[PDB]
Amino acid sequence: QVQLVQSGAEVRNPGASVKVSCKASGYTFTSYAIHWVRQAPGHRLEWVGRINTDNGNTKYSQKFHGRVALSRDTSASTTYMDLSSLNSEDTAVYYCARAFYYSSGVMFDSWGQGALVTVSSAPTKAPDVFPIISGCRHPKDNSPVVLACLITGYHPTSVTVTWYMGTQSQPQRTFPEIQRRDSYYMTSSQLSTPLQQWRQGEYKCVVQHTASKSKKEIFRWPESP
Amino acid sequence: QSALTQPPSVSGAPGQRVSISCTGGSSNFGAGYDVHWYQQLPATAPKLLIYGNNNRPSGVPDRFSGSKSGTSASLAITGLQAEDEGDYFCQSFDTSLSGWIFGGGTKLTVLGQPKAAPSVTLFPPSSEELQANKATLVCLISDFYPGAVTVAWKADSSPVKAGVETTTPSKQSNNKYAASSYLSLTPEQWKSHRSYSCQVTHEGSTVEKTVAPTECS
Ligand code: NA
């Protein structure tokens, strides 16, 4: 299958630079050009530029010429966007997309998953993660318990959460992130299926925060206070 | 105009037909360049929907169709489904800017889906948070439609507004909505009351859940 997979989220100070990558698979890398497009909060999609993956020729938008560079490594089937002199208006999700020819033009037929670049002066901080539970760890009636993980004190957004029973990913409920009064963020993830009894360590929530290069797993819901 | 403009919002009921306009100008649509359309479902990357004015990539429903003139293009959606909700962007090329241009996006809302009452789960502070001298109550609210609730908290029977942070609702994968509310307390406040309650109001009903410091004692 044609696929574009980008690097993870980045945080940078104003005036710094960021390099985002896009690895292509499922087709002959050098046969199709790659475009970069960004999407800020509250703004439309904005074209950044194009790179020919065969010969490395580039075209940039006038808005970004002078502080963007596109490059490619054919041995890695990867293109890179280097954006410098970062400002608060550069906080955005950066996408790569494959250019595909048809009879009377070109379209962007396959898109990477996007990479969030946050431009901020605030310190980066990994989340605290607390196991929370509705009902008691060992219920006194035969009515089920609900597991969740409270994810708090992190910056910037966002986190990614997955639940497992053994090696098997489980359905979850995702909830919006909210900025606390102290400027850090918090969110929650809920294991979707209610439980009655389980072995200690059978279930776990895995919380990834790429901005801090961290992953935290909680696999123990201890006895309540 | 060297920019594409779209209505910010379009809406319709299940099964109805809507169209999304994309107005351009003489340096893009009027210069002979085609329009393409992209669909961006919540929290996903854009996906190619229509290319070359009216062609569908493999897998895109034929309920989506396009037309284009030198002044504007139109994306028609027949038989609206809840799964169609999202943002739609047009795209072309502009000779005066020497580059690709995108419309500002149209948010498509499908109104009049079946009502669904919220599922409410209330969580007390974890033992680990209390050991850190902090206490957060978490009220998780799921599977409701329409996507509007209001949340209220009580300490015993007294309304509490201090310390409350409530999210605005977001659409789930099953076309229903989710939201959350947090009540930040000190451990003293948590322990100084008999119970706390989260009350969720939705379409003419309220549901309340309660937690007590000594429930699992
Ligand atoms: Na294609």
Residue numbers in the entry:
A (entry chain H): 1 to 225
B (entry chain L): 1 to 217
According to the publication:
We solved four crystal structures of a human anti-Phl p 7 IgD Fab: Fab1 (2.75Å resolution) solved in space group P 1 with two Fab molecules (Fab1A and Fab1B) in the asymmetric unit, Fab2 and Fab3 (1.55Å and 1.45Å resolution, respectively), solved in space group P 21 with one molecule each in the asymmetric unit, and Fab4 (2.1Å resolution) solved in space group P 21 21 21 with one molecule in the asymmetric unit. Structural diversity in the Cδ1 domain is seen in the AB (residues 133-146) and EF (residues 193-202) loop regions, particularly around Arg137 (AB loop) and Trp198 (EF loop). In Fab2 and Fab4, Trp198 packs against Leu147 and Leu195, the plane of the Arg137 guanidinium group is parallel to the plane of the Trp198 indole group, and the Arg137 side chain forms a hydrogen bond with the Trp198 main chain. The position of Trp198 in Fab1B and Fab3 would clash with the position of Arg137 observed in Fab2 and Fab4. Part of the AB loop is also disordered in Fab1A, Fab1B and Fab3; although the AB loop is ordered in Fab2 and Fab4, the structure of the loop differs between these two Fab molecules. In the EF loop, the most significant difference between the five Fab molecules, apart from the conformational change involving Trp198, is the position adopted by Arg199. In Fab2, Fab3 and Fab4, the Arg199 side chain extends away from the Cδ1 domain. In Fab1B and Fab3, the Arg137 side chain forms a hydrogen bond with the Trp221 main chain; this interaction is absent in Fab1A, Fab2 and Fab4 as Arg137 either adopts a different conformation or is partially disordered.
Here we report four crystal structures of the human IgD Fab that provide the first high resolution views of IgD. Membrane-bound IgD, as part of the B-cell receptor for antigen, appears to play a role in B-cell anergy in the periphery. Secreted IgD not only recognizes commensal bacteria that reside in the upper respiratory tract, but can bind to and activate basophils. The Fab structures also reveal that the IgD upper hinge adopts a unique conformation among the human isotypes, which may play a role in determining its overall structure.
